[PDB]
Amino acid sequence: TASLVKELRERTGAGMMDCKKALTEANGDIELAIENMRKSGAIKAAKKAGNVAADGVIKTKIDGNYGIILEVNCQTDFVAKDAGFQAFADKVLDAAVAGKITDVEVLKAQFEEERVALVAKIGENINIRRVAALEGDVLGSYQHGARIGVLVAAKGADEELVKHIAMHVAASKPEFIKPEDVSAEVVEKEYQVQLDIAMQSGKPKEIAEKMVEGRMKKFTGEVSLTGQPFVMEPSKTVGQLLKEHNAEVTGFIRFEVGEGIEKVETDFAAEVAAMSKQSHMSFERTKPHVNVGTIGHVDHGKTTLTAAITTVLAKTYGGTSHVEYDTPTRHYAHVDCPGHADYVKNMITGAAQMDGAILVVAATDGPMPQTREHILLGRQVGVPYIIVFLNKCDMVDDEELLELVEMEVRELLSQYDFPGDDTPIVRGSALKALEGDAEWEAKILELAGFLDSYIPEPERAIDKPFLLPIEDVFSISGRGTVVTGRVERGIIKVGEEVEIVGIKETQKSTCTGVEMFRKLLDEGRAGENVGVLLRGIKREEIERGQVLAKPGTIKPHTKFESEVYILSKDEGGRHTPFFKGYRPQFYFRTTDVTGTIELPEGVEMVMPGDNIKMVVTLIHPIAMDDGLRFAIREGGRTVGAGVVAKVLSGASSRNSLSAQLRRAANTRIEVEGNLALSIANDLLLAYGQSPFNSEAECISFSPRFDGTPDDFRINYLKAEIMSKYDDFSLGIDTEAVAWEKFLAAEAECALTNARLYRPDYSEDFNFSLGESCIHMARRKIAKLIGDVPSVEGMLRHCRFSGGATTTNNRSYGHPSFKFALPQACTPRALKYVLALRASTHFDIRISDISPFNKAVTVPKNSKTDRCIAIEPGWNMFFQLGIGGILRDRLRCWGIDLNDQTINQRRAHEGSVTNNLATVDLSAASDSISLALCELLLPPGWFEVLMDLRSPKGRLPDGSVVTYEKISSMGNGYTFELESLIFASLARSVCEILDLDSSEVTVYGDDIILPSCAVPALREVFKYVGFTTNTKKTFSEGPFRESCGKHYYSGVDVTPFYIRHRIVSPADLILVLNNLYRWATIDGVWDPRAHSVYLKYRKLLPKQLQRNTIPDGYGDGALVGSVLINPFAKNRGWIRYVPVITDHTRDRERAELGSYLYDLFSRCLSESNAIDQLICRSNPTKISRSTGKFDIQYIACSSR
Ligand SMILES: [Mg+2]
């Protein structure tokens, strides 16, 4: 009978088919069946311990000054926080205190019976693992939710102190209590093993020794509660925080749930895909994308059901680790929720929201104790609609036991404010439906049947009440103020009435038009990147950040309560917790806005990597409503994100310090002679190295390529370092040399334009390696390229940018001064610009129209200046057109040009391996002869190339040259060309020699191809024109150089260069820093140099020798430790440090060319953690930078 297997099910907690089946064994007896199930119930447990128990809680209790902590494990998050699992792990914590139990086995078997009294009721491997206890004079404890627990005994302190040092251990994981506790053997050998780390690298004993130890000193220092900067005052270690207060800590004990256990990683997608790999062996894009989630008990089959849905909906219909399947009416994305917290994170971050859960319980057992914890997770995230699937029903012969389980779950729902009476509950098997069984097949379709109707359609984005995050405001002359944005939702039809609400008293206005770059429309449609014309509203009555919304739609607020996830260390978030007074920025779709946050009832600290519900109160209002995502930002970097739940009702730095630094900074450091040249020699001397004798030498010294690695790295830094110093007096040297050079660039280029049209050797015998490769080249080339540049790719890849155009100058470089002022044009190229004009309603003016560019002079070395090209600005628009397609294409040859990392890497392989060589090319971009050009190019190309090319050039000297080269460096494509031209050329040498074409990788005149290929590439290059650098091409050294990394037998031997005469503090602060990077092995000096560094650091204004920043945060300060910074004030939990900026007066942008720039972009952007998505690219502001400096406060973290 059914009505009586419920009295036995509601007194045990065990299963429903373990209640009706153990009841037929007691012939029908109540206390009989319960006792039989008892003993037959520890086989369940034993059957369980074959699963990994990873989650679970931690518990702590202290008696006067005797405390204890034990972590009891489960296998699921949800369980760890259930009604019952707390009652058990709380009793095994209370009886561990009184009856004090250090030895673990004691209570594991003293409870062992009541431990199978859970595994039975719940069905999770629950093993009360390790326990210990500590006692001191005053011993305190800290508890972070329940995932991690600290036990700290400190003989000599009060209560506020241990609470806080419990929290510092809680969030810092010190392994030892002091830097001496170090296993005197674990240290007598990790120093005798790191003593090679540098002793092999060639360093002389006493350096490796001192180095290993300075290192080993920190190795310890940091991992020890002594040398661990306190977590609420990082500017001082707990070492001094402890000695400064009366105390000392006798010991500490920190357990974190799950530590040590592996728990192999799970992948819901392939796991359901490979599960149905057994049963797989038997115009309409407008459909809504409703995603769902399966939530429930680990092995009640959320996974075997999520399989049946997919195959059964496969033989019945059409088509962030989310599996997906189809229905006639809509498209579904399914996700599993094996973790309460782990879910929250995904829903806050936006990696997967949810429209409708699907609680999967198995009717074999009915609801579990912790199925309320499931319904919970769903109530909290506020999932609108839940549907329950009752699984494995074939195994209930009695049909009244089903409307019983239904009964049980149908109320668990309504204890949690879901329509527990009215909700769909389908009864079927997830597995019988896998075996192609029609009667249990259609119960699956029965669920996907409910997917269609009960989980309501999400409101389409273009259906909501119009909104557009204003990203910029221009004052167009003759056309009235205008904003540019992307319409978030809704529609705006030219002539309707909008509001501009957010940061300032909400204002209103009216739409006077809608236009793109190409076509001018009359309405904006959600999803589009449009600009919107207004009237009766000036351009300083608007700010990037407020929204353009239909009136009443949305209102500005300053106080709201939200729930955010703050990023872990790994995820590039904070590496340091924060507390009561967090004062960050909160990025809202388009702009940072500072705020102040108040934790909830109980949380006092927050750690990098946990979730949180908090009350954000910003400085000024912002337009919003619930469902809106906001990034949590810190001086530029995201360290969190979070969503908005309820809109509550909304109620340091210095004078002469910011200014005391400013002075310093501006001061001119001063010295007799060549400062740089001395900082050199004193470093040469520091390393035992006969110093430079005359300025003459700094640049005429040639390394030796033997010595140990160390014996080189120095000698190398010695040859290089000074090389590019612009200020050497000693020198009949000029830039007249520079043109003398560029003048044979032609004289050569000619000869090769000549050579390259005439090879018919009077006979048939002669076959030369040149002809051949250019022949393979042409073919290879064409295969990759196309017959001629499509237009589809000409219009996304054309763009303005950079600085100098024949019309604009360095100062008017920004792309808006290219749309602002009318730009030159080669005769030929004209058409293109007309074709552009023919495609926008804005007026693509052109200024003059010459075949002329400007040849010029830019300092580069000491022994020569550099020749470059300032092109017609409309040519360049288009020269970067094909530039960017020669880019996209060169990828099929494995060449990426955005990435000079996959070209230094190999430089280093070659220095150990000796197989790849590095070549280096002299007259690079300045020798690609027109001859060679067409020989290799589809002519469809070689034309659109001769078009955009600049043909003649205008010198400084007033004189002219007409070009022998097809391009000079600075031509909008002269890069992606020479790359492809050299790549093909090598890739063809490769074939001629049976070497892998796959081995040639390139970037500029920096080529890497296999070492044997090199001697041909020499004759092959000799022929086509290029004059190769025998000196800087290494096909056999211990040494390769490529893309700014140099290498010696696999170590880095790159130098750094002293480019300018050093006279500013910003100037020295640099050099000292690059000497810092060049000689540190992770914060740890090499003595030989730490001497010369220190010395010269004393040339600085005082305040400036102690002002230090981490690494890769600038050169506006000395790289060093930021906790030692005296000026560094920790505001609002975020450590703002001060650095030297370059000083810049504001200038006025062309509101139109700045506007055209903005909208051409929306176009180009239209023709192209998980949190970059709530982020933009920003408006245009100008400035000419004075020689003066300035001091900016930024945002830091200690490492
Ligand atoms: Mg190079």
Side-chain angles (χ1 to χ4, degrees), residues 1-99 101-154 156-184 186-282 284-653 655-1167 1169-1198:
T1 189
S3 189
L4 231 70
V5 311
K6 66 89 70 187
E7 182 206 344
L8 115 94
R9 191 271 214 279
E10 197 157 339
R11 187 180 191 255
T12 304
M16 194 72 281
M17 289 320 283
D18 286 29
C19 267
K20 155 98 172 190
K21 90 146 50 185
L23 200 64
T24 175
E25 258 47 70
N27 296 312
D29 195 17
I30 13 277
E31 312 89 275
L32 217 177
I34 60 87
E35 232 282 351
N36 317 150
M37 290 197 70
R38 185 188 287 187
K39 35 195 296 167
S40 60
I43 173 179
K44 305 161 72 92
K47 186 187 208 157
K48 256 59 195 58
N51 330 145
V52 52
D55 226 271
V57 314
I58 283 200
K59 297 288 180 162
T60 318
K61 268 208 75 157
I62 67 93
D63 223 347
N65 76 60
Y66 180 74
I68 187 197
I69 183 192
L70 94 167
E71 75 145 308
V72 11
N73 291 25
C74 52
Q75 51 201 188
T76 242
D77 231 27
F78 280 107
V79 154
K81 79 165 215 160
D82 165 51
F85 180 93
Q86 283 277 293
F88 170 89
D90 278 347
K91 165 190 291 195
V92 80
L93 178 281
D94 279 0
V97 179
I101 314 181
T102 161
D103 211 271
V104 41
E105 276 311 318
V106 180
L107 63 164
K108 189 203 275 188
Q110 155 185 160
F111 277 89
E112 179 67 32
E113 235 40 70
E114 193 215 326
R115 196 201 61 70
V116 311
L118 274 194
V119 65
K121 284 182 35 51
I122 276 193
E124 283 196 10
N125 196 25
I126 166 186
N127 276 78
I128 305 81
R129 178 226 199 171
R130 64 169 173 36
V131 61
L134 191 85
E135 65 180 313
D137 302 32
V138 193
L139 106 162
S141 64
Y142 171 65
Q143 194 78 198
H144 204 47
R147 180 141 207 120
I148 192 255
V150 276
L151 227 30
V152 154
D158 41 325
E159 59 289 319
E160 267 205 20
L161 225 274
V162 264
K163 198 185 214 51
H164 291 200
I165 164 70
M167 301 188 306
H168 170 113
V169 175
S172 270
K173 295 153 279 207
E175 303 182 18
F176 301 123
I177 162 249
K178 54 212 306 174
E180 293 84 336
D181 296 0
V182 274
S183 177
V186 89
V187 167
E188 200 155 307
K189 193 75 182 289
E190 150 89 84
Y191 150 84
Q192 230 102 39
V193 73
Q194 276 213 59
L195 203 150
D196 291 41
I197 303 318
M199 261 265 28
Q200 246 203 319
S201 205
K203 310 163 181 261
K205 209 194 89 167
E206 341 85 79
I207 286 60
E209 212 137 338
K210 194 151 158 80
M211 284 214 54
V212 179
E213 155 146 325
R215 183 73 189 77
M216 288 264 57
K217 155 267 172 160
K218 284 280 203 179
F219 208 86
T220 147
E222 291 199 335
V223 66
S224 330
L225 212 174
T226 285
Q228 276 189 10
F230 176 49
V231 81
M232 262 172 296
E233 211 76 336
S235 23
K236 67 207 286 73
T237 77
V238 190
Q240 149 103 352
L241 170 274
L242 211 55
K243 270 305 190 289
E244 73 161 18
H245 283 272
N246 37 198
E248 155 63 31
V249 300
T250 145
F252 65 103
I253 283 299
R254 71 104 61 190
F255 280 139
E256 198 199 328
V257 173
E259 289 171 329
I261 323 170
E262 250 279 306
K263 173 47 179 60
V264 42
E265 164 74 11
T266 169
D267 175 35
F268 195 51
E271 170 165 348
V272 61
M275 176 174 297
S276 59
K277 202 205 81 171
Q278 170 62 332
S279 187
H280 282 309
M281 214 67 70
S282 310
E284 166 85 334
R285 261 63 88 166
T286 190
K287 61 206 307 181
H289 293 286
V290 175
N291 44 36
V292 294
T294 171
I295 183 59
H297 188 112
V298 54
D299 65 20
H300 273 28
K302 287 176 299 192
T303 45
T304 89
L305 191 206
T306 198
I309 288 205
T310 62
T311 71
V312 167
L313 288 189
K315 94 206 285 182
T316 295
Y317 306 108
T320 47
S321 193
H322 49 89
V323 300
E324 45 197 354
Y325 51 67
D326 256 75
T327 275
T329 174
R330 47 174 78 144
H331 179 236
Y332 293 120
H334 191 115
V335 281
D336 192 52
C337 324
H340 188 297
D342 193 24
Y343 171 93
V344 161
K345 185 168 166 176
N346 290 13
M347 164 271 192
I348 284 187
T349 200
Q353 40 142 69
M354 199 146 55
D355 313 312
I358 172 231
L359 185 81
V360 172
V361 326
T364 296
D365 280 12
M368 306 315 303
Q370 85 272 223
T371 259
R372 41 164 37 102
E373 325 285 324
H374 296 320
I375 318 173
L376 186 43
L377 187 266
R379 160 47 50 195
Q380 288 193 6
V381 58
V383 67
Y385 299 101
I386 288 178
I387 308 189
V388 155
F389 180 96
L390 261 32
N391 193 31
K392 280 145 53 178
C393 281
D394 66 296
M395 291 174 51
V396 189
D397 38 58
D398 202 3
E399 198 267 1
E400 190 82 54
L401 277 190
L402 295 173
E403 287 213 39
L404 203 220
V405 167
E406 270 206 31
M407 261 298 90
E408 271 191 312
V409 37
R410 275 191 198 261
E411 288 312 314
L412 250 188
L413 283 206
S414 260
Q415 270 176 319
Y416 297 82
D417 282 34
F418 289 109
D421 283 19
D422 256 334
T423 172
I425 315 275
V426 296
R427 327 187 210 177
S429 187
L431 189 30
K432 283 297 183 200
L434 282 166
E435 310 166 340
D437 164 11
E439 311 150 20
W440 303 100
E441 263 185 2
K443 285 311 188 188
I444 278 304
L445 299 87
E446 169 158 355
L447 188 60
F450 291 158
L451 261 31
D452 293 331
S453 37
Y454 184 86
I455 293 188
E457 200 181 55
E459 200 188 8
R460 316 182 205 269
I462 69 198
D463 295 351
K464 296 148 191 171
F466 171 78
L467 201 145
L468 175 144
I470 300 189
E471 304 178 30
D472 216 9
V473 251
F474 322 67
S475 217
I476 311 298
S477 268
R479 203 218 234 72
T481 308
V482 64
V483 292
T484 59
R486 172 187 182 114
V487 40
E488 219 178 20
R489 74 213 187 170
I491 256 71
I492 188 189
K493 305 178 159 189
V494 296
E496 300 177 356
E497 272 208 39
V498 272
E499 288 202 14
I500 135 205
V501 35
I503 330 160
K504 294 181 280 201
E505 169 214 313
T506 148
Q507 311 165 197
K508 43 177 70 273
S509 181
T510 176
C511 163
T512 92
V514 167
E515 49 188 327
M516 315 212 315
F517 175 73
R518 333 158 62 197
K519 59 260 204 204
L520 207 162
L521 331 166
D522 56 22
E523 65 161 2
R525 210 160 184 108
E528 297 191 317
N529 268 121
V530 292
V532 167
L533 272 170
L534 266 49
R535 82 169 78 265
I537 185 77
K538 319 177 171 194
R539 86 95 150 180
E540 81 287 358
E541 336 198 85
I542 312 182
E543 307 200 355
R544 187 201 184 205
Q546 43 184 183
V547 313
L548 206 54
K550 190 188 270 75
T553 285
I554 162 175
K555 292 289 186 311
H557 311 273
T558 72
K559 213 165 206 205
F560 65 75
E561 67 174 357
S562 62
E563 309 156 288
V564 326
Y565 170 75
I566 113 161
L567 303 170
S568 81
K569 202 156 180 170
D570 317 49
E571 312 166 326
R574 291 173 67 83
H575 81 322
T576 319
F578 73 76
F579 310 81
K580 161 176 186 166
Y582 199 56
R583 205 171 177 290
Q585 297 102 218
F586 300 75
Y587 195 94
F588 278 90
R589 61 202 144 205
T590 207
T591 172
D592 267 1
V593 15
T594 223
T596 54
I597 57 89
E598 42 186 304
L599 300 340
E601 263 294 348
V603 45
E604 50 183 354
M605 176 183 69
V606 173
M607 292 199 319
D610 62 348
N611 296 278
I612 220 281
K613 305 177 41 46
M614 90 196 328
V615 200
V616 180
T617 147
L618 341 149
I619 164 67
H620 8 82
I622 270 281
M624 70 194 189
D625 195 37
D626 54 347
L628 182 77
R629 273 165 179 76
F630 67 88
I632 290 174
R633 219 104 154 293
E634 206 165 304
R637 187 63 48 149
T638 37
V639 299
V643 299
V644 297
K646 200 59 55 172
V647 274
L648 290 184
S649 290
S652 37
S653 184
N655 178 58
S656 356
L657 210 275
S658 334
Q660 206 190 36
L661 279 152
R662 208 270 190 157
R663 189 183 325 158
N666 270 104
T667 213
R668 168 166 306 197
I669 141 290
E670 59 186 352
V671 260
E672 30 217 355
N674 201 323
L675 162 56
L677 175 40
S678 293
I679 296 210
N681 287 185
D682 284 9
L683 201 37
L684 285 197
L685 262 36
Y687 282 83
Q689 295 282 16
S690 32
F692 289 115
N693 42 226
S694 52
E695 304 221 333
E697 206 208 336
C698 313
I699 50 174
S700 38
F701 167 75
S702 351
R704 209 168 93 198
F705 280 93
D706 40 67
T708 112
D710 179 81
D711 266 348
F712 178 90
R713 185 178 216 264
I714 222 333
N715 205 61
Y716 192 52
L717 168 59
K718 150 152 175 172
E720 288 300 284
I721 205 188
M722 275 317 302
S723 53
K724 330 184 165 201
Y725 184 63
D726 47 51
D727 187 67
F728 287 115
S729 223
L730 288 55
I732 70 256
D733 300 13
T734 158
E735 81 212 316
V737 44
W739 300 105
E740 297 181 45
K741 283 167 148 289
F742 151 108
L743 251 37
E746 290 309 70
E748 242 275 42
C749 218
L751 265 312
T752 89
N753 279 338
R755 209 199 323 303
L756 270 45
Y757 305 123
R758 60 101 160 301
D760 62 11
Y761 10 76
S762 286
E763 64 198 1
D764 288 324
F765 294 110
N766 252 306
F767 293 106
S768 86
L769 183 55
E771 209 171 72
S772 340
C773 270
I774 114 163
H775 270 114
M776 271 147 280
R778 183 210 63 78
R779 207 167 212 80
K780 315 262 293 305
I781 278 162
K783 195 222 292 302
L784 210 203
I785 282 190
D787 305 342
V788 79
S790 64
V791 205
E792 31 151 354
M794 193 59 98
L795 267 310
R796 71 177 169 243
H797 279 276
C798 266
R799 82 214 147 80
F800 264 125
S801 267
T805 91
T806 190
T807 23
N808 299 12
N809 49 66
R810 296 225 37 185
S811 145
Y812 290 118
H814 188 91
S816 85
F817 295 122
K818 309 269 171 47
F819 297 93
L821 321 317
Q823 291 275 164
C825 203
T826 234
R828 326 207 20 181
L830 171 77
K831 29 174 162 178
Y832 298 98
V833 25
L834 308 182
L836 166 50
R837 174 189 299 183
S839 36
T840 178
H841 57 261
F842 305 84
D843 57 355
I844 309 310
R845 335 209 91 289
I846 113 169
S847 87
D848 271 274
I849 199 193
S850 163
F852 278 86
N853 56 189
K854 285 189 169 73
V856 293
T857 224
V858 49
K860 154 194 165 158
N861 268 20
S862 316
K863 56 164 55 83
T864 184
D865 287 34
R866 207 203 173 198
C867 304
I868 205 203
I870 282 134
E871 298 265 324
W874 274 123
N875 285 16
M876 262 257 305
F877 187 72
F878 292 91
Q879 289 162 334
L880 311 160
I882 78 289
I885 142 167
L886 289 212
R887 202 165 281 265
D888 275 5
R889 254 68 177 166
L890 242 34
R891 267 192 304 92
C892 289
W893 295 14
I895 326 223
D896 195 16
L897 286 155
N898 318 134
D899 199 16
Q900 36 191 145
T901 220
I902 67 168
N903 203 41
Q904 335 168 135
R905 277 213 256 296
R906 317 180 82 204
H908 147 263
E909 192 215 306
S911 58
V912 13
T913 284
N914 228 288
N915 288 132
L916 309 184
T918 64
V919 322
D920 181 48
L921 288 193
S922 281
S925 24
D926 303 317
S927 321
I928 304 112
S929 56
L930 288 133
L932 185 64
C933 244
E934 41 189 338
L935 302 203
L936 282 42
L937 276 137
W941 287 80
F942 173 93
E943 230 220 343
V944 33
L945 222 41
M946 287 301 291
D947 287 15
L948 271 39
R949 153 200 165 80
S950 274
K952 306 169 185 290
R954 171 77 57 178
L955 276 25
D957 305 343
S959 53
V960 266
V961 285
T962 77
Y963 289 149
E964 251 64 59
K965 44 213 199 193
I966 210 260
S967 190
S968 33
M969 212 296 284
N971 191 310
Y973 63 41
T974 198
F975 185 60
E976 291 84 337
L977 182 83
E978 59 162 340
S979 279
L980 146 92
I981 276 169
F982 294 132
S984 63
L985 242 37
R987 264 177 164 260
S988 284
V989 163
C990 265
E991 235 145 284
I992 292 279
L993 306 170
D994 220 353
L995 317 139
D996 218 13
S997 269
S998 237
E999 285 323 63
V1000 83
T1001 216
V1002 156
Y1003 184 104
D1005 51 334
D1006 212 321
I1007 292 154
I1008 277 65
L1009 84 168
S1011 289
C1012 319
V1014 153
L1017 221 61
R1018 254 167 76 192
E1019 186 222 332
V1020 164
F1021 283 172
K1022 180 178 63 182
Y1023 170 81
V1024 335
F1026 330 135
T1027 193
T1028 145
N1029 198 186
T1030 177
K1031 304 285 85 158
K1032 264 125 79 173
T1033 59
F1034 308 92
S1035 53
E1036 83 171 27
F1039 185 87
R1040 300 322 133 95
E1041 69 79 30
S1042 194
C1043 280
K1045 274 18 205 88
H1046 308 59
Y1047 282 89
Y1048 207 101
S1049 309
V1051 291
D1052 173 328
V1053 307
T1054 97
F1056 59 111
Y1057 302 88
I1058 301 222
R1059 285 187 214 278
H1060 308 306
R1061 182 173 79 195
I1062 163 159
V1063 286
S1064 159
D1067 291 23
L1068 238 212
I1069 284 216
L1070 162 68
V1071 176
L1072 300 192
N1073 271 178
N1074 297 156
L1075 186 60
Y1076 175 82
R1077 298 134 165 173
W1078 190 86
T1080 273
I1081 286 68
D1082 190 347
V1084 163
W1085 273 82
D1086 172 332
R1088 274 172 299 192
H1090 198 350
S1091 87
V1092 196
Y1093 169 84
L1094 275 203
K1095 154 162 177 165
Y1096 286 85
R1097 199 237 285 100
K1098 293 178 322 199
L1099 266 278
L1100 300 205
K1102 282 42 197 179
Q1103 299 92 155
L1104 267 30
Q1105 303 178 24
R1106 218 169 320 154
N1107 180 222
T1108 49
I1109 32 165
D1111 196 352
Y1113 265 98
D1115 275 4
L1118 271 164
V1119 183
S1121 174
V1122 82
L1123 311 125
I1124 262 331
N1125 199 131
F1127 314 90
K1129 258 280 93 250
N1130 205 276
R1131 259 143 53 182
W1133 282 127
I1134 145 70
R1135 145 171 270 94
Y1136 296 82
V1137 108
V1139 277
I1140 333 246
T1141 291
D1142 253 337
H1143 184 242
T1144 58
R1145 306 208 95 179
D1146 283 286
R1147 292 204 321 195
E1148 78 149 41
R1149 80 189 184 182
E1151 292 297 319
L1152 201 268
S1154 292
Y1155 178 76
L1156 275 195
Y1157 174 73
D1158 167 292
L1159 270 175
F1160 170 66
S1161 305
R1162 268 54 141 75
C1163 187
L1164 281 224
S1165 272
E1166 207 79 58
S1167 218
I1170 315 266
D1171 309 279
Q1172 256 281 28
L1173 295 159
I1174 37 203
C1175 284
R1176 284 283 89 168
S1177 296
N1178 46 67
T1180 295
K1181 312 300 185 204
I1182 309 307
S1183 60
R1184 54 133 221 153
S1185 88
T1186 73
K1188 294 188 76 192
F1189 310 80
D1190 211 328
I1191 293 293
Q1192 173 149 344
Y1193 277 75
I1194 56 195
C1196 242
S1197 65
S1198 313

